Structure formats: structure tokens, C-alpha cells
Amino acid sequence: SLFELGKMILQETGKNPAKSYGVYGCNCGVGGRGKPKDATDRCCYVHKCCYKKLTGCDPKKDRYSYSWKDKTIVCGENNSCLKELCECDKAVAICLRENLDTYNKKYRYNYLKPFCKKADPC
Amino acid sequence: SLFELGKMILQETGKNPAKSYGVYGCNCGVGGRGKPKDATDRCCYVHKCCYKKLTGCDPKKDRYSYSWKDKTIVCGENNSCLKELCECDKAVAICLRENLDTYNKKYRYNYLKPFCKKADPC
Numbered sequence: 409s410l411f412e413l414g415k416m417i418l419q420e421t422g423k424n425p426a427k428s429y430g431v432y433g434c435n436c437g438v439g440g441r442g443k444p445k446d447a448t449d450r451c452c453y454v455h456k457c458c459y460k461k462l463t464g465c466d467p468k469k470d471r472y473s474y475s476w477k478d479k480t481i482v483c484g485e486n487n488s489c490l491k492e493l494c495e496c497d498k499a500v501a502i503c504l505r506e507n508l509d510t511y512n513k514k515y516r517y518n519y520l521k522p523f524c525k526k527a528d529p530c
Numbered sequence: 531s532l533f534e535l536g537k538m539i540l541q542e543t544g545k546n547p548a549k550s551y552g553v554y555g556c557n558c559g560v561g562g563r564g565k566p567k568d569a570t571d572r573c574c575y576v577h578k579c580c581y582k583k584l585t586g587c588d589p590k591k592d593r594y595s596y597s598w599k600d601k602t603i604v605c606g607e608n609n610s611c612l613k614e615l616c617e618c619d620k621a622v623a624i625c626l627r628e629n630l631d632t633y634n635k636k637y638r639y640n641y642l643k644p645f646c647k648k649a650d651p652c
């Protein structure tokens with residue numbers, strides 16, 4: 409679900425998910441994928457490519473369970489579709505955390521998103 | 531295409547179309563439709579509904595020709611899909627101009643688009 413994804417991004421990056429990443433670059437938030445603009449954008453590219461491989465579940469709405477073992481996000485069992493989905497959300501939240509220092513606020517509100525260059529079908 | 535649409539919006543409103551409207555409200559720019567926030571937003575809602583009926587061409591990518599008869603945008607060669615595409619774009623550019631008196635910069639970069647209340651069927 410969008411609300412579990414936002415929780416993980418807030419806990420991993422310390423930033424508000426919607427404001428800092430909701431319109432970021434060519435891949436983060438609304439819209440689809442495009443030529444990634446930096447490391448942070450590449451994370452959202454892989455995450456959207458991750459979402460594309462889910463067959464029988466709705467990433468935006470279908471909820472899932474997850475827990476925290478020390479600093480590690482643990483995805484609880486709940487069908488392979490929701491497991492991979494939690495693993496997609498864990499992946500992007502860790503990814504955004506790992507590349508915080510290359511975050512660039514000049515791509516935060518990318519109002520040229522539809523004019524991004526084409527990308528590959530994942 | 532988006533190139534002709536942006537040209538119309540610039541000519542009618544005098545504003546940078548991508549910066550001013552690319553992420554505006556719940557309906558303008560990248561993303562889908564949602565509960566409109568104001569009159570400018572409702573222009574984009576109507577325009578997206580207009581695009582929905584163009585099942586025979588690509589509204590974002592397919593180029594077309596237009597010109598001006600005095601102060602009225604005149605859409606050219608009646609290729610059925612491309613003619614109606616041009617008319618969709620002319621309608622929103624005039625709608626945006628006529629509603630500049632309530633344009634709200636607070637909605638310009640709506641990073642909360644995915645949390646907009648769902649819209650009615652077109």
C-alpha cells in the first residue's frame with residue numbers, strides 16, 4: 409500500500425515521502441518511468457520496474473504486514489504477490505536511504521516529467 | 531501533441547505551461563484525474579476526459595497543425611482523431627486563460643496528487 413511505502417521511506421530517509429519524492433526527477437511519484445536524473449531517481453525507476461512485475465495484486469491499495477528487527481525491515485509472509493511487493497517497497501526505501509547525499513532539490517518538483525527521455529522496458 | 535498543447539497554453543495564458551500547470555491541482559499535468567480543487571483544475575479535468583474519447587490516436591505524441599483566424603484558434607485537416615485532439619487542446623488553453631483570475635500558486639506543485647479524492651466517471 410501507498411501508506412506502508414510512505415512509512416518505510418519516512419523511517420529510512422527521514423524525509424516526508426510525498427514532498428521530497430512525490431514529483432522527483434523522471435521516475436519518482438506520479439507518472440511513469442523515464443531517463444533517471446540521479447541515483448535517487450534510479451531507485452524510483454527500479455521500484456516502478458519492480459511494480460511492473462507484480463501480476464495479481466494492487467501496489468497502491470493492497471496492504472501488507474511488515475516488522476522491524478533492529479534496523480532491518482522484515483517482510484511478513486502473505487502470498488508471493490504481496491511478499492514481492494513489500495520487498496519492492498523495502499528495496500526502494502533502502503535505496504533512497506543509501507543515496508541521500510546525492511539527493512538534489514532541483515529535481516524535486518519536475519514539472520517537465522512528460523518531457524523526460526524514453527526508458528527501457530525493465 | 532504536447533508540443534502543440536503547450537504552444538496554445540502559452541499563447542492564451544502568457545504563462546510557462548509546464549511550470550504553471552504541469553503539476554497543478556488534482557488534474558493538471560502528469561497523473562490522472564481527481565476531485566478538482568478549483569476552476570483551473572476543472573479545466574484540466576475536462577481536458578483529460580476529452581482525451582479519453584480519442585481512441586484512434588496518441589494525444590501526447592501525435593503532432594497536428596493549427597493557426598489563428600483573428601483571435602480564434604482554427605484547427606486544421608479533419609483527420610477525425612487529430613482534429614478532435616486539436617479541439618481538446620484549444621478548449622483547455624482558453625479555459626485556463628479565462629480562469630487565471632483564480633489561479634492559485636499554492637496548488638502549482640501538488641505532490642499530493644496520489645491522495646486526491648477519486649473523480650467521477652467521464
Ligand SMILES: CCc1c(C(=O)C(N)=O)c2c(OCC(=O)O)cccc2n1Cc1ccccc1
Binds near residue numbers: 413415425459644
Ligand atoms: C518515492 C516515493 C513515491 C513513489 C515511488 O516510490 C516511486 N517508484 O516513484 C511513488 C509512486 O510510485 C509507485 C508507482 O508508480 O506505482 C507512486 C505514487 C507516489 C509515490 N511516491 C510518493 C509517496 C509515496 C508514499 C506516500 C506518500 C508519497
Ligand SMILES: CCc1c(C(=O)C(N)=O)c2c(OCC(=O)O)cccc2n1Cc1ccccc1
Binds near residue numbers: 522533537560575578
Ligand atoms: C494543463 C497543462 C498540461 C496538461 C493538461 O492540459 C491536463 N488535462 O492536465 C497535461 C497533460 O494532460 C493530458 C493527459 O494527462 O493525458 C499531460 C501531461 C502534461 C500536461 N500539461 C502540462 C504541459 C502541457 C503541454 C506542454 C507542456 C506542459
